[PDB]
């Protein structure tokens, strides 16, 4: 802003319908002070705020510690007061380049004596001049007759800490209503055709995301089925619809003749393509025996599922071991 309000008239603004992008200013660290109370810039992710009050002004940095709740001192009781429960972040940066020049500035006016403490959320506007009723002058600038405001000046001899600092206090408000504005959260890339634990706008589920031809509506976000279970999701990042499917769950059956005949066995994974057999929590078991049936030369894709350890044959014989879908396994020949 080209013009800044007085120190005693700190400019108050309301920020809403947006989230502070602290990431851009995090690495840059252009401002020299990011004093956050009871919170840190990195830990703000686990917290949500609805609106912000920004109080912008120019002050002296040395006083920042002095102006705090619970301070024991008479000086702090006549400068400014803040509520004990304060959750605001003070962002302060030096501005001596533009706010300072040759000869100094005499634009700072403060108050030394006041009628009483400043009541919170209290405004007093009036053009009447207050004159002390004890020993009023009314015709001369005598005792008990002085200007209400006192000028304050800063000189070049003052150190960097004593130089004026542009300071904005951002106080985040919390209301009984549920939080609606939250800081941006890192989003992982989009993956498809593989089991994943997907968290879409707070909706958490587990399944495989695949391209869908379903036609949603502009207001519609989620999807459901006859059994009111999630079936499709509209990704907020890009305008498309992704389906959801159960990951792999099935069953494992062992087909084998009587142990008297032979010890050879075959495995049957229910209603699963053979591509997902080895990845189905295998490779962490006995190599010589189990991993042989996890993947091998002889693999058959039947309506029941995937069969490993059997060879499909042109000839058709009477059913011996029932597998299903018209397919049976026999050890003979």
């Amino acid at each position, epitope marked *: 802003a080209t013009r800044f309000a007085s120190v005693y008239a700190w400019n108050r603004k309301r920020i809403s319908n947006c989230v502070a992008d602290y990431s851009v200013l995090y690495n840059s*660290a252009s401002f020299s*002070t990011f*004093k956050c109370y009871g919170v840190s810039p*990195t830990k703000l992710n686990d917290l949500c705020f609805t609106n912000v009050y920004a109080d912008s002004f120019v002050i002296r940095g040395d006083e920042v510690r002095q102006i705090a709740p*619970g301070q024991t001192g008479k000086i702090a009781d006549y400068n400014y007061k803040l509520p*004990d429960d304060f959750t605001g972040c003070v962002i302060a940066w030096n501005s001596n380049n533009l706010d300072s020049k040759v000869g100094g500035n005499y634009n700072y006016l403060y108050r030394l004596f006041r009628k009483s403490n400043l009541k919170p959320f209290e405004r007093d506007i009036s053009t009447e001049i207050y004159q002390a009723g004890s020993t009023p002058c009314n015709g001369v600038e005598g005792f008990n007759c002085y200007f209400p405001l006192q000028s304050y000046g800063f000189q070049p001899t003052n150190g960097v800490g004593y130089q004026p600092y542009r300071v904005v206090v951002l106080s985040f408000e919390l209301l009984h209503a549920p939080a609606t504005v939250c800081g941006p959260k890192k989003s992982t890339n989009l993956v498809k055709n593989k089991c994943v634990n997907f968290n879409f706008n707070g909706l958490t589920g587990t399944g495989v995301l695949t391209e869908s031809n379903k036609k949603f509506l502009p207001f519609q976000q989620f999807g459901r089925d006859i059994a009111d279970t999630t079936d499709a999701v509209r990704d907020p990042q890009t305008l498309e619809i992704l389906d959801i499917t159960p990951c792999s769950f099935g069953g494992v059956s062992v087909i084998t003749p009587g142990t008297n005949t032979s010890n050879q066995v075959a495995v049957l994974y229910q209603d699963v393509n053979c591509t997902e057999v080895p990845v189905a929590i295998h490779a962490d078991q006995l190599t010589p025996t189990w991993r042989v049936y996890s993947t091998g030369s002889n693999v058959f894709q039947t309506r029941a599922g995937c069969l490993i350890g059997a060879e499909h044959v042109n000839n058709s014989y009477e059913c011996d071991i029932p597998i299903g879908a018209g397919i049976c396994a026999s050890y003979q020949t």
Partner: nanobody
Amino acid sequence: QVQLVESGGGLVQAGGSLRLSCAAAARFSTSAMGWFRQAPGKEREFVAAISWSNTNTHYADTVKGRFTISADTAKETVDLQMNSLKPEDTAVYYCVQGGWGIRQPIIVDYWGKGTQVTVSS
């Protein structure tokens, strides 16, 4: 006025180990903690500071490497263990709650009642 509970301190034998604990009704995970000591003839001096994540530990170079600070979120307390006690530890210790600041070593927002620590040889 914030009601903070301080445990430990008291009188301890020199050359041993000391345990201090500070508890507040407010969360400690979201707010950085600090321990400060004041003794006669000296003003406020930095002693120990721990950030929100309990990963950034700050101590005075002259006493660094002997104080271990931990934060228990379940108990919502901060514990400090001191080894190789020395007479300089005889002071009054305050536990302060606040946030992390790049400019200052620690930002103080809420002060503590304080605990007297004395060392006898």
